[PDB]
Amino acid sequence: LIAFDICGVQPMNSPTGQVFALRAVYGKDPVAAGAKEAFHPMYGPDAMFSGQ
């Protein structure tokens, strides 16, 4: 076997767990279509947001 060193684990002591995730969102519509993420790894900052 390949064991499990190729994946994570997050073991359970009780069934059915849940995980949250936080996103920084700009434009006064944190929950919305087009509500762009501030720190997404593949996107640059909206440089002219706070600027001109």
């Binding site: 060193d5 994946c7 994570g8 684990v9 997050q10 002591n13 059915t16 995980v19 997404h40």
Partner: protein
């Protein structure tokens, strides 16, 4: 190269390699294997004919690292299943990339 841990897919169907990222944490790996119950033996016999019967049961569960898709600023419906399927993991997970190899 002293950098990647290489494992052999002893049952590979065609010919390929998959490069993946794995962090130091149990919660930073793209996909997770989360065991709950393992190898519980069960034994008895069927009085109808008295032949013995035995077996084992387990329970695990797997899931998607939040943001593994890495192709969206936001999820739809805000409460989602983290269990992989054709709609949320197939060909989408940022942690792994698969390349087929020919001509060896």
């Amino acid at each position: 190269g002293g950098k990647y841990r290489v494992y052999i897919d002893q049952y590979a169907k065609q010919d390929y390699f998959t490069v993946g990222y794995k962090g130091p944490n149990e919660m930073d790996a793209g996909i997770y294997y989360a065991p709950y119950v393992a190898l519980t033996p069960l034994r008895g016999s069927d009085p109808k004919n008295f032949q013995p019967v035995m077996g084992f049961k387990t329970r695990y569960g797997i899931g998607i690292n939040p943001f593994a898709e890495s192709a969206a600023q936001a999820p739809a419906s805000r409460i989602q299943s983290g269990m992989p399927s054709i709609l949320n993991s197939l060909g989408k997970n940022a942690y792994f990339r698969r390349v087929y190899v020919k001509g060896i």
